Structure formats: structure tokens, C-alpha cells
């Protein structure tokens, strides 16, 4: 069903849908690990399905149609606690590279493409534990795609070699994120 922001479980999978209060987003949970997000002049939003909690060696599969019209990402996305980290393995994005302005730390090859690695910091921002300052870890895929498999261990290990460690995992999903743009997407996770 089409729902407003919230988290829960649907057809065997965890889901998380969040937005900044701006309208224009239509998030809908479907059968199994499927969800769709259609947005028209949204603000910032993040929604998708997966697991609560995630693991440090999960092989995540995704497939679907991803049609962003502006700033948007398609990523394996999740968090850990102690340390508090928001991480991304970006498989596809629209008109804006999320690593713009960030300092590159290295490169890792996984699942058919090179990824560039970066760390950024969010200061006094919303998080799974409320307002907080925390780091974000990024693997940005060079060869964009809308379906495939992500061996998360390759990324977590690559990050660890650069000193980017993860705490106890919280949720881990395949998420569509948008930032003041429009677009359409339908994804199935497994």
C-alpha cells in the first residue's frame, strides 16, 4: 500500500520511508521485497526495503526500473550504532554525484565495476537516534545500473582498510533517495 513516512515489516522485509516534510512523494510497498516510489517535485526523501538488522556480509540483490529526473540515488543504504554511521553503496544516481566536494580515499572493484570511496560528515542532523553529528561512508559505482548483486563485504572491508569502521548494524535496505526533484522507480529486493 501507499503509505506516509514510517518503518515496519512488509511481506518478509523491513522497510523504511522517510522524508523532510515536503510533499510530492508517493511511496508504495508491494509483494515480497518490492516497493515503488513516484515523486513529483519532492523535497528530500529516502525509502526502500531490506532487513533490520543488516549484516556485514550480506549479498543483496536488486532489480527494477529507475528513472530519476534530477537529484536522486539508488543505493544499498543503512546505518550502524557505536559508531553511528549512515552508509551508501550507490549503484545509480541522477544529475548529482553524492561525492561532489568530498575527499576521495580510494577505489575498490566489486560486482562488475570500480567504486570510488569517500567519507563525509553530517553535523547536527536528523538520524536514527535523533539530532546528531556523524560520519557517512560512500562507495560510488562508476558504471551505473538498475539491477544486480552487491557483495556488501567487499565494501565494508575496503572502507575498513581506509579506517572507516562500522558499529553494530541497524537497518540495511535498497533505497531510492531524492532531493528536490522528480522521478519514478520500482525496485525488488532480495
CATH number at residue 181: 2.60.120.180
C-alpha–C-alpha distance, residues 28 and 181, integer Å: 18
Would residue 107 show up in a list of annotated catalytic residues for this protein? no
C-alpha closest to that of 127 among 159, 82, 178, 179: 82
Its domain, for residue 22, covers: 2-190
Q: Which residues pair with 61 in a beta bridge?
A: 149
To 10 degrees, the CA torsion angle through 152, 132, 180, 8?
Answer: 60
Would residue 177 show up in a list of annotated catalytic residues for this protein? yes
C-alpha–C-alpha distance, residues 186 and 38, integer Å: 8
The tally of domains found in the chain comes to 1
C-alpha closest to that of 54 among 19, 83, 81, 90: 81
Positive or negative: CA dihedral 110, 116, 122, 126: negative
Place of cell 551508501: 88
To 10 degrees, the CA torsion angle through 87, 88, 94, 99?
Answer: 70
Of 39, 78, 177, 181, which is the active-site residue? Answer: 177
Positive or negative: CA dihedral 132, 159, 98, 65: negative
Amino acid at each position: 500500500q501507499t503509505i506516509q513516512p514510517g518503518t515496519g515489516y512488509n511481506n518478509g522485509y523491513f522497510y523504511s520511508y522517510w522524508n523532510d516534510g515536503h510533499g510530492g512523494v508517493t511511496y508504495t510497498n508491494g509483494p515480497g521485497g518490492q516497493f515503488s516510489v513516484n515523486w513529483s517535485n519532492s523535497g528530500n526523501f529516502v525509502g526502500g526495503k531490506g532487513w533490520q538488522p543488516g549484516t556485514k556480509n550480506k549479498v543483496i540483490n536488486f532489480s527494477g526500473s529507475y528513472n530519476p529526473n534530477g537529484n536522486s540515488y539508488l543505493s544499498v543504504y543503512g546505518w550502524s550504532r557505536n559508531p553511528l554511521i549512515e552508509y551508501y553503496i550507490v549503484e545509480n544516481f541522477g544529475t548529482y554525484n553524492p561525492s561532489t566536494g568530498a575527499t576521495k580515499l580510494g577505489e575498490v572493484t566489486s560486482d562488475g565495476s570500480v567504486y570510488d570511496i569517500y567519507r563525509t560528515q553530517r553535523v547536527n542532523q536528523p538520524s536514527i537516534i535523533g539530532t546528531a553529528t556523524f560520519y557517512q561512508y560512500w562507495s560510488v559505482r562508476r558504471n551505473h545500473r538498475s539491477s544486480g548483486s552487491v557483495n556488501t563485504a567487499n565494501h565494508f572491508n575496503a572502507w575498513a582498510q581506509q579506517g572507516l569502521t562500522l558499529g553494530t548494524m541497524d537497518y540495511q535496505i535498497v533505497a531510492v533517495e531524492g532531493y528536490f526533484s522528480s522521478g519514478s522507480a520500482s525496485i525488488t529486493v532480495s
